[PDB]
C-alpha cells in the first residue's frame, strides 16, 4: 500500500523568493534560530509522515536535514 | 591509395539515368529547331565570329561537353 508524496516544491525550508536574511540583535537568536531551523523542519516532515506518506517525489532541491529527517522517518525520495 | 588516384567511378542505375538525362538534355535544346515553322539559332564561337544556322549539326558541332554520351 504505497503512500506517494508529490511536490513540484523542492524539499527545503520554503525559501521566500524575496531576501529575508536573518538579522540578530542579541546572542541567543544564534542558538535559537538554527535549532528551530532544525526544529520546524522536523515538524514539517513529521506532519508529512503523520499522514503515512512513505515516498516523496520532486525534481526540485532537497534540504539535507529534510531528507535526513525523512530517513529518520523511513521515507522514500525522488529527485 | 589503390586504383588510379583521383579517377572517379560510377555504376548502375545512376549511370544509366545520367546518360538518359544527358541524352534528354541533348534533344530538347534542339526540339524547336525543326520544321517549315522551325526556329533559327545564332551561336557564339570561341574565336569571336558569329554563326547562325538552323541545321542542328553545326549547332551541335559548336558544342563543348563533358558528359561522354553527350559527346
Amino acid at each position: 500500500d504505497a503512500k506517494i508524496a508529490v511536490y513540484s516544491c523542492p524539499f527545503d525550508g520554503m525559501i521566500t523568493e524575496t531576501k529575508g536574511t536573518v538579522l540578530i540583535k542579541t546572542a541567543e537568536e544564534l542558538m535559537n534560530f538554527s535549532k528551530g531551523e532544525e526544529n520546524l523542519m522536523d515538524a514539517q516532515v513529521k506532519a508529512i509522515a503523520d499522514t503515512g506518506a512513505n515516498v516523496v517525489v520532486t525534481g526540485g532541491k532537497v534540504a539535507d536535514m529534510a531528507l535526513h529527517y525523512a530517513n529518520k522517518y523511513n521515507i522514500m525520495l525522488v529527485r | 591509395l589503390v586504383l588510379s588516384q583521383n579517377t572517379k567511378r560510377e555504376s548502375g542505375r545512376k549511370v544509366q539515368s545520367g546518360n538518359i538525362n544527358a541524352a534528354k538534355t541533348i534533344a530538347d535544346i534542339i526540339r524547336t529547331c525543326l520544321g517549315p515553322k522551325s526556329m533559327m539559332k545564332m551561336l557564339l564561337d570561341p574565336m569571336g565570329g558569329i554563326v547562325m544556322t538552323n541545321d542542328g549539326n553545326a549547332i551541335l558541332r559548336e558544342i563543348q561537353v563533358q558528359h561522354p554520351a553527350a559527346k
Binding site: S8, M14, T16, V22, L40 | -
Partner: protein, 106 residues
C-alpha cells in the same frame, strides 16, 4: 494557448467570462524594500504574508464566482493578458476555475 493545469476543465457547457489584464503572478513592490526577520518561524510567517496580497486578489474573484456561480452547472472562465501564479492556478484548481494568462493586448 490553453490552461496550464491538468485538472483544468477542458470543456464547459456554460461559460461566465472574466476578462482582465492584472497579473495574478506574484509581484514585489516598485520600491526597494529590504526586509529581514529573526525567526525561521517568522520566515514562514513571512512566507504566508508575502502570498496574502495575491491571496486576496484571487479571493475576490472566487467569492464573486461563488457569488455568481452558486449553481454547479455553470462554468467560470478567466482571461488575463499577463501571467498567473501556479499557487493562484491551484487556487482556481481547487475551485475548478478556468483561467487564462498572457493574452495579446487586442
Amino acid at each position: 494557448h490553453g490552461a496550464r493545469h491538468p485538472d483544468m476543465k477542458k470543456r464547459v457547457e456554460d461559460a461566465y467570462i472574466l476578462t482582465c489584464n492584472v497579473s495574478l503572478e506574484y509581484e514585489k513592490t516598485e520600491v526597494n524594500s529590504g526586509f529581514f526577520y529573526k525567526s525561521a518561524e517568522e520566515r514562514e510567517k513571512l512566507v504566508k504574508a508575502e502570498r496574502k496580497f495575491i491571496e486576496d486578489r484571487v479571493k475576490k474573484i472566487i467569492e464573486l464566482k461563488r457569488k455568481v456561480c452558486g449553481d454547479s452547472d455553470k462554468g467560470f472562465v478567466v482571461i488575463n493578458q499577463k501571467g498567473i501564479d501556479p499557487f493562484s492556478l491551484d487556487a482556481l484548481s481547487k475551485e475548478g476555475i478556468v483561467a487564462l494568462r498572457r493574452a495579446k493586448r487586442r
